[PDB]
Swiss-Prot record:
Gene (name only): CYP2A13
Phenotype upon changing R227C: In allele CYP2A13*2
Enzyme class: oxidoreductase
Native organism taxonomy: Eukaryota, Metazoa, Chordata, Craniata, Vertebrata
Name by which UniProt lists this protein: Cytochrome P450 2A13
Molecular function as annotated in GO: arachidonate epoxygenase activity; coumarin 7-hydroxylase activity; heme binding; iron ion binding; monooxygenase activity; oxidoreductase activity, acting on paired donors, with incorporation or reduction of molecular oxygen, reduced flavin or flavoprotein as one donor, and incorporation of one atom of oxygen
Binding-site positions, heme: C409
Cross-referenced PROSITE patterns: CYTOCHROME_P450 (PS00086)
Cofactor(s) recorded in Swiss-Prot or TrEMBL: heme
Organism of this sequence: Homo sapiens
């Protein structure tokens, strides 16, 4: 009846001394090279259990999937959410807001023809945008996020933002900034020492500012929607939820009230924007570093699709190389290295170890994506990871950027279809040029913390 081994914590600071807040993953991966695939850490006051490799992670989150289905803290987002919404909540609230969210996204056609024709249409609205930069050197950052956010916006708001909207440019700035903070040294020190640091001046404060800015906005769309509602036919995600808040007024235990609504919508709007767009911004850089991979994707396009029409999402079965490249950007790029934290919601026996009720769990998603048993060159960019000798597509149990188990990314379906199309559609129209030689492109991360962020680069989209 004892915890997993680990370095001796100090009082209050925990294992501050053996942790590099500038790369948290490598610090935790060094400790496991010494203790094992399951060890115990303290980030400040918080006792965490950290899981390493495909085996540790799968047996935790899938084989005992119920007991590891809790949610732990991300103190940056916990300052805003306070345990409300679909993503950062626990128990009876998590199961209801999740059950309702999946059912509703399917209403608006996630992984269906509706959202296909929305993405397909927005993808062309971006093609125009990039054909009108005329080959000149740009930052791809806010072009991509604009386009990516517009898909999720259609679902949650009822329609899209205009690309010329000054206030829209602002909301995307608020996501990029709050998100990049979680990845920085101070971001990872804030995980450790939130209790103190939320009252101290510093970068943390600028990130509450933008979080606060984001909530405000969403709560202004909830007001406008609320007063102009039509109870017998819904326009968007907010409306459907409003319709369920009415029906649930007689029930005092309901999880469908104003604050849960507002929080769950931000979960969706924030996640539908910054994780598919970073993945693309990373993927472009990885394509200009690897020109022989770019040329091969282009060729698979012209023979399967051509130049005339617009790529669908079933054009995908006849495209094994391009679908490998997209899985390999997703695995190399390593979006959320430690995932969202979990928690055991009751006393738990796991592998001879004991985990008390409320124990926090770090499922290292990045160490599965770099499990050397499943990948032959774990830290190189090789699309042959996702192919066999006959050139067809090879699924891997260690491809887990979207997590596994009971609290896994229900936004995975939307994201898969978005990635395929955006990537195919852009590269069907343009080839990418860098202002620097392929041997001189630094494809290593700028910040790695809660997210993996790629470095800054300028680029050209010149037509074919
Ligand atoms: C490449 C893009 C994306 C990646 C790599 C990604 C990855 C992840 C990961 C690792 C989790 C953690 C789940 C856990 O607790 O174990 C997660 C959760 C979540 N994701 Fe995504 N995600 C992406 C895009 C999206 C999109 C487009 C949406 C919008 C519908 C979304 C919505 C969510 C939500 C609501 C959760 C919380 C689930 C819960 O706590 O029940 N994600 N995602
Ligand atoms: C930026 C934090 C995001 C949020 O508020 O809701 C969930 C989320 C974390 C996340 C999950 N999938 C993508 N992201 C960025």
């Amino acid at each position: 009846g004892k915890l997993p081994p680990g370095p001796t914590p100090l009082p209050f600071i925990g294992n501050y001394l053996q942790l590099n807040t500038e790369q948290m993953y490598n610090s935790l991966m060094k400790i496991s090279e010494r203790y094992g695939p399951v060890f115990t850490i303290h980030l400040g006051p918080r006792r965490v259990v950290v899981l390493c490799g495909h085996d540790a992670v799968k047996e935790a989150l899938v084989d005992q999937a119920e007991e590891f289905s809790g949610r732990g803290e991300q103190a940056t987002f916990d300052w805003l959410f306070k345990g409300y919404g679909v993503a950062f909540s626990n128990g009876e609230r998590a199961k209801q807001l999740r059950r309702f969210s999946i059912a509703t996204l399917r209403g608006f056609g996630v992984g269906k023809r509706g959202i296909e024709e929305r993405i397909q249409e927005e993808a062309g609205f971006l093609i125009d945008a990039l054909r009108g930069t005329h080959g000149a050197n740009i930052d791809p950052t806010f072009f991509l996020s604009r386009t990516v956010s517009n898909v999720i916006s259609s679902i949650v708001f009822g329609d899209r933002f205009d690309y010329e909207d000054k206030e829209f440019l602002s909301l995307l700035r608020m996501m990029l900034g709050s998100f990049q903070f979680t990845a920085t040294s101070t971001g990872q020190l804030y995980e450790m020492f939130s209790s103190v640091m939320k009252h101290l001046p510093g970068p943390q404060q600028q990130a509450f500012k933008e979080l606060q800015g984001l909530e405000d906005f969403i709560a202004k769309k909830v007001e406008h929607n609320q007063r102009t509602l039509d109870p017998n036919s819904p326009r968007d995600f907010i409306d459907s939820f409003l319709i369920r808040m009415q029906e649930e007024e007689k029930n005092p235990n309901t999880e469908f009230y104003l604050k849960n609504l507002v929080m769950t919508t931000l979960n969706l709007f924030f996640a539908g924007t910054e994780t598919v767009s970073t993945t693309l911004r990373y993927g472009f850089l990885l394509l200009m570093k690897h020109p022989e991979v770019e040329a091969k994707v282009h060729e698979e396009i012209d023979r399967v699709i051509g130049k005339n029409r617009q790529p669908k999402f079933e054009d995908r079965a006849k495209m094994p190389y391009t679908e490998a490249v997209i899985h390999e950007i997703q695995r190399f790029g390593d979006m959320l290295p430690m995932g969202l934290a979990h928690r055991v919601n009751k006393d738990t026996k796991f592998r001879d170890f004991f985990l008390p009720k409320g124990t926090e769990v770090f499922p290292m998603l990045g160490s599965v994506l770099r499990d050397p048993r499943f990948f032959s060159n774990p830290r190189d960019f090789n699309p042959q990871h996702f192919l066999d000798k006959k050139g067809q597509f090879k699924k891997s149990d260690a491809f887990v950027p979207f997590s596994i188990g009971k609290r896994y990314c229900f936004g995975e379906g939307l994201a898969r279809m978005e990635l395929f199309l955006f990537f195919t559609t852009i590269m069907q129209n343009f080839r990418f040029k860098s202002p620097q030689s392929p041997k001189d492109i630094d494809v290593s991360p700028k910040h790695v913390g809660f997210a993996t962020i790629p470095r800054n680069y300028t680029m050209s989209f010149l037509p074919r």
